[model samples]
Target: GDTKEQRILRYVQQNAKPGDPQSVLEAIDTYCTQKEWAMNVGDAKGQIMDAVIREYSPSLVLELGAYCGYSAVRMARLLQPGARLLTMEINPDCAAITQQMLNFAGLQDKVTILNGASQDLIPQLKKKYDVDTLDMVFLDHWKDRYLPDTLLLEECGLLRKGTVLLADNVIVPGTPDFLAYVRGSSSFECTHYSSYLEYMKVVDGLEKAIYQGPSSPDK
Candidate 1:
């Protein structure tokens, strides 16, 4: 059997309308829903993410995972001119496929796909990528990296006040520690959206956490 990523890539190539992000998205969603299950954040949660982008209009965005460029296309399509997104995929194969996906959707100019581990790439956001501050961050990679990488973001001072960190899969394949830190921390204000896991009836949700910056602790 073809690997899930390979299958989706082939499906999108044959099914999606060339250069149309919406068509690309629909193709991916259809494949996931009707063909087989693969994690692309699905359409329900995707809409929530779309609303966030539209609301904030972030000039610079960062995505931790570029799984076949599904979410990257979703985000990049909504970006205004001059706004861009950086997506990191640790697996070289995944990174390569995502590049092809971006090219097909005509999102190559809007989304920069990089191949590197989150631990190394995140620290280089300023020096390597010349990023000022990440206006929005989408964390959808590994459940284990969620907590540590987030701490890394804070320690490196990459996140600013009002920076939105939207995390997926908080319920199903959950990130308990990350959820704990974001919701329990004094420096974050969180809004939880009740939604299902992609293409299934299984219960799941998204955690929308806004960084409030450093704050004095209550005695």
Candidate 2:
């Protein structure tokens, strides 16, 4: 009678402590692992995500996909005071669920949920959020959009030198072209962390990169 997302909400509402970010995060992960599969970054790779956030301590974070708001909640709980994370999701239903989940986690003020295609919404960040630079980006959306969106982010000057990008599911569903571009680009440096797909042991990994601005090849 209920969708998996609804099940997640029901479980969390009953089991998780209201306004407790950690409790909500654990409940979601448990639902995904023990009940149904979700596209969240999961507990394993989440550690890596947590480590990166700790490492950079970014104030402005961007997430390309917000499936059920699991990752957004995770990141928002760690963000320093006054920091914010803006996440984009094309599916209105998913966006609604994410909004609810984040609100339940007490992260409504620290995170913004944008409902629209990334292509349409990304270019508006500057005006909408007054964000000229992105401190960190998590690419967990449609794999094919990865490279194009990154290019668009670059074109819009959203990505600045030292901006970090951590991409999920790069090796499972795989973003080969995106991976190649990041690895080959002269303006970016990348590192790969060998891992497993969420809820599976099959081969998967994340691509962590630092934007170094652009390179003008000598004439």
Candidates in order, TM-scores: namely 0.95, 0.96
Q: What is the TM-score of candidate 2?
A: 0.96
List where candidate 2 sits over 4 angstroms from the true fold. none
lDDT of 1 by residue, 144-178 (tens): 99889989998898999999999998887788999
* True lDDT of residue 182, candidate 1: 88
Q: Best-fitting candidate, measured by TM-score? A: 2
How does each model score on lDDT? 0.91, 0.91
lDDT of 2: 0.91
Q: How much lDDT does candidate 1 score?
A: 0.91
